Chains A and B, each alone.
Chain A
Amino acid sequence: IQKTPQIQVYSRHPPENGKPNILNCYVTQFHPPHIEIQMLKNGKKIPKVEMSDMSFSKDWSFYILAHTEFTPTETDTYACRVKHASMAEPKTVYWDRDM
């Protein structure tokens, strides 16, 4: 059966404006394994996104970690956008340093 991806976005280090950091997008609980993941800066696709090898959990659902270098500022937004056969519309989750 099809399972919808969960998406969590979080920084590697405490966010400090103007300091290089790494932004993580962890995508879990999906089936089938095929998936497209984009990371976005101010709504534009970020070109250098690295991704772990996909694997799966004990419940058989798949997961993968995407990550990118970023330098947070007061005004830049960042998001992770995922396309998966389980939903007609891509799903977007924004980084929110306060959450």
Chain B
Amino acid sequence: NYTFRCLQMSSFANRSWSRTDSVVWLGDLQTHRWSNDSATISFTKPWSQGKLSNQQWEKLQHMFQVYRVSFTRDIQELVKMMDYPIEIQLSAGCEMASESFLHVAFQGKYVVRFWGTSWQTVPGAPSWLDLPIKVLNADQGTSATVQMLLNDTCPLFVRGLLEAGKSDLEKQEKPVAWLSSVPSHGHRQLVCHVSGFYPKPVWVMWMRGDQEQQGTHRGDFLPNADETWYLQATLDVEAGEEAGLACRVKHSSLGGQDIILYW
């Protein structure tokens, strides 16, 4: 089981300026980039073509190249047929049996999805979308292509990515931790920093002996530039009461030997 996401972002500033850029993710690892400046989709892993032959890949890429041009023209003609700037986003892919998705946002709000055999507006979406969605639904060629991509190509492609990218997808990188502190009068905030771990699942707790300190406040997962993760966990403490505290880190890469740092 994983989630595969193709994320398209298109910005239209006026009749004469637009760009479309995409990134593709398998789980949390980037597999492709497609810059507006590039005629072709760029691999960001050795294994980004999955198990598709060069011919199958080229066919799939040509489809997208045609789509990128058509999408841009169609949106520009929609605006002319009717307020710049316009931001449109598309999130498409599959998860795992496997189920696929294609969701579209306009000005940062989800408005349309592809579902089964047709495009649908979501409840609450602006009513001016109904007519252009109708006309889009009359394009059976496009409908059929989208069905094939979502039902067939997406899970097929993902299965191949999983096989080809096995050593990266299942890589283990060890966290390194360190402690610091700041004032928060008398009270201080202790900080346990944990960086460089992969994969993402991790356990980080302030402790006193074998007792977990429920004041432990875990931050968000923040990316490092080298495809590992960073996390910190803080603890507010009264003056002097710092003594005896430790930060404990458990991670799959550690082979059952937790990191424990003592304040």
Q: Nearest chain A CB to B104's CB is how many angstroms away? A: 10
The residues in B between 186 and 243 inclusive whose CB is less than 8 angstroms from any CB of A are 189, 191, 193, 195-196, 220, 222-226, 230, 232
Cβ-defined partner of B109 (8 Å) among A13, A24, A55, A60: A60
Is B97 in the interface zone, CB < 8 Å from A?
Answer: no
The residues in A between 7 and 27 inclusive whose CB is less than 8 angstroms from any CB of B are 8, 10-15, 22, 24, 26
**Given A12-B225, A14-B193, A26-B222, is A53 in contact with B180 using a C-beta cutoff of 8 Å?**
no
Q: Which residues of B contact A15 (CB under 8 A)?
A: 178
Looking at chain A's contact residues, the main secondary structure is: loop
Cβ-defined partner of B225 (8 Å) among A24, A56, A62, A96: A24
Is A99 in the interface zone, CB < 8 Å from B?
Answer: yes
Contacting pair A56 B9 (CB below 8 A): yes
Is B110 in the interface zone, CB < 8 Å from A?
Answer: yes
| Residue tally, chain B, CB below 8 Å to A | 35
Q: Which residues of A contact B87 (CB under 8 A)?
A: 31-33
Is A3 in the interface zone, CB < 8 Å from B?
Answer: yes
A-B contact count (CB 8 A): 84
Q: Nearest chain A CB to B7's CB is how many angstroms away? A: 5
Is B176 in the interface zone, CB < 8 Å from A?
Answer: yes
Kindly state the separation between the CA atoms of A67 and B11 in the bound complex, as whole angstroms: 25
Q: Of all chain A residues, which has the CB nearest B230? A: A10
Q: Nearest chain B CB to A4's CB is how many angstroms away? A: 13
Cβ-defined partner of A13 (8 Å) among B9, B180, B195, B220: B195
Kindly state the separation between the CA atoms of A65 and B30 in the bound complex, as whole angstroms: 13
Is A1 in the interface zone, CB < 8 Å from B?
Answer: yes
Q: Which residues of A contact B47 (CB under 8 A)?
A: none
* Interface hub of B11, B107, B222, B225 (most chain A Cβ within 10 A): B225
Task: Annotate A67-99 by CB proximity to B: 1 below 8 A, 0 otherwise.
Answer: 100000000000000000000000000001111
Contacting pair B191 A53 (CB below 8 A): no
Q: Nearest chain B CB to A72's CB is how many angstroms away? A: 13
How many chain A residues sit at the interface, stated as a range, is: 20 to 34
Contacting pair A99 B180 (CB below 8 A): yes
**Given A13-B195, A54-B9, A98-B182, is A24 in contact with B224 using a C-beta cutoff of 8 Å?**
yes
Contacting pair B222 A24 (CB below 8 A): yes
Kindly state the separation between the CA atoms of A67 and B230 in the bound complex, as whole angstroms: 14
Kindly state the separation between the CA atoms of A12 and B195 in the bound complex, as whole angstroms: 6
Is A52 in the interface zone, CB < 8 Å from B?
Answer: yes
Contacting pair B105 A65 (CB below 8 A): no
The residues in B between 137 and 175 inclusive whose CB is less than 8 angstroms from any CB of A are none
Contacting pair B89 A60 (CB below 8 A): yes
Residues of chain B having any CB pair with chain A under 8 Å: 7, 9, 11, 21, 23, 25, 30, 33, 85, 87, 89, 91, 105, 107-110, 176, 178, 180-182, 189, 191, 193, 195-196, 220, 222-226, 230, 232
* For the complex of A and B, 3 pairs with smallest distance between CB atoms: A14-B178, A31-B108, A98-B180
